[PDB]
Subunit: 333 residues, 3 copies
């Protein structure tokens, strides 16, 4: 009755991928919620595997290189993430749930994931492409670049740096699909189209509906459910009305319900191997904003592990006459 | 031109069905709005039939029995509600509009309604099943149980209590349909499926669309429009973004528009006999929250009585030349 | 690659069409945003043509006539708007973008537009019909009447006034289509139906979906894309959740996404000649409300000029090896 009976939980408090302080509190925002209690109530055994400790260099140790900010913190953090994720993945099936942390963590989680499962596919749920190459990034923020280091067809656009040697590109462009895009930089658009990356923007969601979008995205990168799935979910893919506490909010996003449909369908493939939830920042917005964002996150992560909005059956059906209590029906004799 | 030319309005300020103070102000929240003025402007004669006075026992008079809180207040209130509702229903057709009050009132309104119209059907619009049997309720809150006392197929799960004798089960499981469910307890799911109660969750709304959901719900319990309809609308069926002032908000609800489509279609059957609106609590949230919730409620109740978003025709068409005023067209001679 | 490579921007700070102070700050709310910067980044040359200065008579100069408030301010303002708009339109094609200002400005913008392009059609995006004739207006507010002075079939319902002589009716009822209606006065409904004006209410959007609604609206008034389009967009057509800072908010409106689809499809006809955005009032609501409303407006206006949510291609593709930088791919030799 359960597709996944156990799962692992991992925190990654990255905050050097972007300038707003507070994404490091992401994992704690979910640990303080009722997420663990709710997942236990659906009968899933969830093991907390702790937090990964990011490498945060002093400013003097990590100057800008090719416009990138904190790039040495990034390379070192990426290798440390990959090792731990690889270990957990090599250690039905047991999904790994990861809570960020800004989205720069994805270079490491996927690198590590791909080590254990080289044939995986990636579903990237995001308002943004996160695939700027360093010389094209207007900001230099690493959370806007994590896919460009992973995609093989892009490596003539990545500047060589010796500390990036261990970050080997493990994805073909044919293995990635986007859902929810609405704020692409022109150079991301060029690369996505040039190398044929499957992508479904909010325009596509409006015109096709999310059911057909989810279907087409799975067909494009996992046509027969043969591949492990890495689901990389930026909370800002969701409309700011339901996920306001995030650093780069873009209006006109996914409703919570559309976000749940994505997670529900991906969960039910049986192939969900890693889900990561990025860009929660509880230091942004009002207290009510933070509670809305926390709530949307918890509902999203529960859907990934298999929670069904149509309800769950009890493990043991309770009966009145078994407790030696007279029912109304019984009394009417 | 009017399906219903008159209607009755009844307040039921129940607040012992759940622990948060303030549902007793529900009827006043609607009486203070412009609802009466707006319904008059569409040409409907609305008669205010006052409030029912709930029986609220002192704590010492009403101890917990089988985990239920305030169960004697509930049985006594239920019988008092049923008598008044039966009277009003026996007294086209004239819909009764009821404003709660927490949802525990429904055991009484339906009991009373069914006395006058034993063949009725129930459309239950709610995030929740409200059909916990007493021994399965985690909370003991009566607003989470009103249907379990009414449904015939469940009576071997209701503990006998002498003061509950006059609460006779008047519904078959085949007469109830749910729309909007997204937070079912496992034992409700068991009972709903075991006894074949028609139900459409937010998953079904996402996959089928609300038009097909409404259609299938009416087909399931009122296939040829032969039966009177009791529409029991929990305001928390609506998304918290539009109805925040309610005690058990659940994210990912019905949009206001989907809520209006339900009410518009039910109204246009000609069979709307009672509509009740439960769980308004103006003591929850900010002032703006309360105004949003009040507004959503007023729009919902107007749709039930037949308000059309596509507009209404005037009772008397006004003409300029009849007031002896020269028009631009006339002057151009 | 660009349907429109240049455009004009015009402010019209009307505020005598309705009693709430603050619509005069509408144009500044958009000038302070990043709208100009964003439109430049998509490669469009946008020329700011300044503001039109409304005629705001002293109260003693402009008494009520036929219940109308500030009607002489209105007639004088309308003629001044029309002259400037006619001039700009006579001066691919170059869309005029107009930011209000309350919606009473539309009598002048369309009058002026029609002078330059007498065969145009009008797409009116609004919660309201804005077509009350003076003797039927409950309020006397001119922003609720701008279409009644323009529509030829209505001129026996317009009271003659000598200062209104230069406001000649330039629209046939067959040239106008509404989208988003949900708060029609009974006499507007009568006139819209009597004279066969195409209209799509929120009921129609719910039942048909916005894609079919947009399609049917264009078919009704511009079946072969032969006519110039005047797009008159009241910000209150959008749901109050995304455009709260406006004077007559009505719940259950267009989502931002549905609003974008309207603008995207109208833009892509190639026939968008004027778009006006009315009823922004930054003196209403909280600071956050104002920022939400500003944001929704900016996204709407960018879609009108051709912004694509699916992304834009760079004007010059950047290449790493052209900057004399060794790529990772290159280094791996
Ligand atoms: N595309 C921008 C924004 C990325 C935002 C990531 N959440 C960049 O590369 O920096
Ligand atoms: N299912 C829960 C919540 C009910 C909430 C009713 N509005 C219960 O039985 O108490
Ligand atoms: N229909 C009303 C409201 C118009 C509101 C315009 N934004 C009137 O004529 O005054
Ligand atoms: Mn993002
Ligand atoms: Mn991202
Ligand atoms: Mn409920
Ligand atoms: Mn309820
Ligand atoms: Mn309007
Ligand atoms: Mn308007």
């Amino acid at each position: 009755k359960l597709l996944y009976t156990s799962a692992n939980f991992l925190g990654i408090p990255t905050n050097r991928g972007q300038p707003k302080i507070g994404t490091y509190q992401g994992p704690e925002l979910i640990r303080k919620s009722n997420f663990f209690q709710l997942v236990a109530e659906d009968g899933i055994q969830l093991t907390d595997c702790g937090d990964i400790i990011p490498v945060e260099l002093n400013e003097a140790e990590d100057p800008q290189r090719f416009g990138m900010k904190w790039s040495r913190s990034f390379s070192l953090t990426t290798l440390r993430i990959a090792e731990r994720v690889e270990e957990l993945m090599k250690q039905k099936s047991t999904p790994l749930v990861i809570v960020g942390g800004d989205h720069s963590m994805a270079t490491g989680t996927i690198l590590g994931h791909a080590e254990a499962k080289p044939d995986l596919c990636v579903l990237w749920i995001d308002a943004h492409g996160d695939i700027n190459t360093p010389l094209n990034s207007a900001s230099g923020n690493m959370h806007g670049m994590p896919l460009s280091f992973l995609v093989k067809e892009l490596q003539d656009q990545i500047p060589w740096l010796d500390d990036f040697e261990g970050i080997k590109p493990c994805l073909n462009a044919s293995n990635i699909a986007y859902i929810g895009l609405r704020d692409l930089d022109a150079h991301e658009t060029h690369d996505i189209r040039k190398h044929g990356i499957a992508y479904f923007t909010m325009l596509d969601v409006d015109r096709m509906g999310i059911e057909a979008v989810i279907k087409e995205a799975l067909l494009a990168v996992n046509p027969r459910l043969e591949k492990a799935i890495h689901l990389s979910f930026d909370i800002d893919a969701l409309d700011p009305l339901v996920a306001p506490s995030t650093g780069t909010a873009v209006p006109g996003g996914l409703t919570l319900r559309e976000g749940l449909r994505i997670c529900e369908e991906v969960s039910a493939t049986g192939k969900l191997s890693v889900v990561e939830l990025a860009e929660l920042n509880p230091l942004l917005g009002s207290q009510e904003d933070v509670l809305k964002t926390q709530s949307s996150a918890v509902h999203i992560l529960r859907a990934c592990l298999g929670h069904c909005r149509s309800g769950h059956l009890p493990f043991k059906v309770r009966n009145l006459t078994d407790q030696g209590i007279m029912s109304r029906a019984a009394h009417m004799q």
